[PDB]
RNA sequence: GAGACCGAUAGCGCACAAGUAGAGUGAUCGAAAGAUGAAAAGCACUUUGAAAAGAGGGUUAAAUAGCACGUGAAAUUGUUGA
RNA sequence: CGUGAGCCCGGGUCGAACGGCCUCUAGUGCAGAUCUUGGUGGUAGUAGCAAAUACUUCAAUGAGAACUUGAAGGACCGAAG
RNA sequence: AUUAACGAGAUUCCCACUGUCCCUAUCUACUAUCUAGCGAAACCACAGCCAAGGGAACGGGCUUGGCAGAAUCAGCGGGGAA
């Protein structure tokens with residue numbers, strides 16, 4: 001069904017040891033992998049603003065924690081119509097520490 | 105157009121010829137050998153999973169220096185691969201053959217891939233440039249892929265007579 | 273659509289490089305029909321094609337250092353790399 | 368000499384082939400000689416490596432330099448929850464070796480045992496030993512009685528089927544490690560009644576081993592993967608001018624024999640080998656219920672054996688444990704086999720009666736300086752928390 | 753005008769848009785390449801495919817002659833059978 | 835069938851010429867010559883496709899998009915570029 | 916014959932310095948590695964387990980023994996008088 005939740009991704013433990021010039025590209029991949037493990041949808045779109053947030057400090061500097069809003073939606077016509085797709089947005093919070101999972 | 109079977113009557117079967125396809129012959133021969141003898145629906149689904157790396161084509165004859173996989177345990181081999189280009193061409197032929205069967209009125213649900221072979225095609229010419237000013241060939245290995253869908257002595261005689269009489 | 277010739281035409285009309293040309297992403301269908309320079313400059317007046325401002329290169333940090341140099345700051349032996357004759361020739365001093 | 372300057376061989380020929388062990392649980396290749404005068408007793412046990420720590424004790428060795436001085440020495444902590452006995456195996460002696468004649472299983476086997484018999488326990492029907500329990504029930508268990516009579520009359524070696532309680536350890540594994548332990552001791556009749564009475568009854572490490580016993584520890588060493596010649600065999604590194612690689616053996620054989628020999632160092636697998644480390648003295652057999660497991664008669668602090676912040680990558684210890692001197696093969700969380708010594712000890716060091724003086728409980732996650740949270744609070748005063 | 757000549761790796765380098773294409777600064781060097789069918793009658797139309805094509809269907813004495821075209825060996829390869 | 839080089843017949847494909855016997859004639863018999871020309875293998879789906887720092891998100895086009903296009907972000911050349 | 920200055924010239928010693936070494940260990944990037952696509956070449960009598968004997972006097976084949984169980988992946992540099 002359609003459900004939206006706010007998530008905190010402890011991105012620091014996913015980027016541990018990752019080669020520089022690959023950290024920011026892998027952060028996009030790990031967000032897609034994170035969205036799949038949460039909402040069970042293989043089709044994950046990422047908001048362009050969240051792309052800016054990940055790429056904010058260059059390719060090596062990625063935030064230790066990211067507060068995102070994963071919203072599982074319904075595919076209308078494109079491709080497999082009955083499928084569900086997940087849309088990940090960015091939560092504009094300056095204190096991503098100390099938050100739990102919140103259903104929106 | 106003549107197929108290698110010539111014993112399958114083209115009245116209760118479906119065919120798709122396929123010719124001069126620029127896909128690896130070695131990869132397509134191994135992909136077709138897995139499909140050989142399967143149900144049409146199973147074979148179509150199997151090739152769909154190969155495209156998504158869900159299940160793998162076992163490499164048996166042309167498997168020198170390749171790598172192992174755990175998805176080769178289904179066929180009992182150690183070496184397996186996922187020839188996406190070969191499986192994508194074969195899906196076009198299976199779809200074409202199934203289309204012909206439907207036009208002829210054949211029952212699609214009980215079709216079986218009974219004959220499928222892959223023959224080599226005339227190679228294509230390209231060059232590669234090596235050290236010290238040498239030039240070597242850079243050859244493609246295309247193929248043709250045809251496919252058919254179906255669903256006493258006197259003493260012995262005297263002994264036999266005695267045997268019948270004596271036996272109860 | 274392909275708009276490589278649109279940024280080339282817009283760059284020449286506006287007098288700047290192709291890196292400073294902005295074509296509206298929501299109007300690419302109508303921009304793609306701008307095959308002539310007269311049509312390109314019509315879009316500029318309409319507002320679909322916009323010249324981006326130059327990237328800022330501020331100098332005040334250099335000005336602050338020069339002002340501090342005037343009052344004697346950042347002048348010690350640890351900030352001198354050339355010889356005294358290179359920093360102030362005696363030929364000029366005598367002159 | 369045709370070998371200009373000669374040196375001893377690199378490596379041991381007695382540990383080949385240096386390949387991955389065919390097992391993950393250490394195997395008791397041989398059990399002690401089974402004197403028939405001593406009372407019946409088990410000879411082996413299984414625990415899990417928790418980690419290492421250091422102790423201080425007063426040495427006692429007349430004639431040594433440190434005859435009555437304090438020595439700092441490392442020990443290994445093995446977590447040993449009590450084992451359950453679930454079976455009895457009889458062995459007969461044949462001109463082809465020892466042969467397992469029959470096996471007797473007690474009823475009511477726990478799921479920890481039953482998981483050892485599946486690879487996909489989660490989706491199975493768990494039918495293991497479902498039809499077997501009828502042997503204990505039907506005919507007043509006459510089927511089991513016949514098998515017990517067979518073991519007494521025929522078999523000359525009796526073993527129990529052991530069972531770990533991995534659910535009591537801080538490991539994500541739910542499969543229990545099953546084992547055969549030989550009942551060394553009296554007559555064959557005594558061994559069967561000893562093993563039969565032990566069915567489904569937990570056996571603590573306290574009974575098997577004593578405080579000052581010298582034991583052997585059997586485990587699979589730490590794996591290193593595919594490693595080169597210098598790491599596997601410790602050969603001399605080649606000069607830095609070498610063209611095609613430095614960490615290699617230069618001559619891998621003469622012209623004749625025209626073969627690469629088995630005695631020449633080659634790259635391959637290192638670690639994950641089965642090893643039997645012998646002559647390890649026990650220092651303490653702690654209790655899982657006591658709140659002062661690390662407390663001695665000199666250091667009277669009521670502190671447990673778990674260091675501050677827990678053992679690194681293992682967890683806490685809430686069961687019985689064995690403190691063994693020195694290091695042992697394997698890694699943390701690895702199941703390890705403890706076996707009684709097969710030798711006779713006459714050295715003063717082996718016969719030495721140890722008495723601990725202090726046990727370190729500072730954190731191993733860093734340069735920990737405090738042995739208990741209470742001591743940390745008095746030294747540091749009050750914080751912002 | 754002829755031949756006890758050669759017959760497409762032969763006979764002139766050239767049976768063909770051959771001293772051509774191509775190589776070399778240049779002097780010069782210099783190939784490969786013949787054959788559907790009596791007649792294009794060179795596959796209308798339907799269907800699957802994005803398309804190349806495939807399957808039906810039709811031309812022909814023959815497509816086991818489809819312009820990759822007289823016959824179609826071997827090396828080498830695929831399927832089936834033993 | 836013949837000791838043999840070879841000859842003959844049956845079955846399949848093919849479509850325009852061919853053979854025996856007696857003499858005459860020769861550019862007349864191949865396993866090799868690092869033989870000549872053309873074609874084809876194993877090796878082998880192998881070696882490999884690793885210098886010049888680096889790409890990511892959305893949308894459109896399209897049967898199909900890492901290397902098409904627009905927007906956004908991140909970078910490089912750094913005026914002897 | 917001797918020579919100040921000069922020398923990517925040859926040689927010896929001393930100071931400093933350092934993984935050259937005692938004696939190795941560890942880290943990073945790109946490969947190697949696995950996958951999708953693409954895809955060669957050298958070489959090739961036939962092939963590919965040894966010991967001894969004899970032999971053109973150092974055998975993969977012979978003789979007498981030892982033995983010997985499908986198919987494979989990553990390394991390796993003894994042999995193939997490669």
Ligand SMILES: [Mg+2]
Nearest residue numbers: 016017018019
């Ligand atoms: Mg690392």
Ligand SMILES: [Mg+2]
Nearest residue numbers: 169170880989
């Ligand atoms: Mg390889």
Ligand SMILES: [Mg+2]
Nearest residue numbers: 168169987988
């Ligand atoms: Mg090999």
Ligand SMILES: [Mg+2]
Nearest residue numbers: 235236237238
């Ligand atoms: Mg060149």
Ligand SMILES: [Mg+2]
Nearest residue numbers: 357361362363
């Ligand atoms: Mg002057």
Ligand SMILES: [Mg+2]
Nearest residue numbers: 368369370371
């Ligand atoms: Mg020597």
Ligand SMILES: [Mg+2]
Nearest residue numbers: 608609610611
């Ligand atoms: Mg060198």
Ligand SMILES: [Mg+2]
Nearest residue numbers: 814816848849
């Ligand atoms: Mg004909």
Ligand SMILES: [Mg+2]
Nearest residue numbers: 814817822823
């Ligand atoms: Mg014909």
Ligand SMILES: [Mg+2]
Nearest residue numbers: 821822823824
């Ligand atoms: Mg032909």
Ligand SMILES: [Mg+2]
Nearest residue numbers: 825826827828
């Ligand atoms: Mg043939």
Ligand SMILES: [Mg+2]
Nearest residue numbers: 790822849850
């Ligand atoms: Mg004719």
Ligand SMILES: [Mg+2]
Nearest residue numbers: 860861862863
């Ligand atoms: Mg001749």
Ligand SMILES: [Mg+2]
Nearest residue numbers: 862863864865
């Ligand atoms: Mg000839």
Ligand SMILES: [Mg+2]
Nearest residue numbers: 864865866869
């Ligand atoms: Mg020949």
Ligand SMILES: [Mg+2]
Nearest residue numbers: 866867868869
């Ligand atoms: Mg030759």
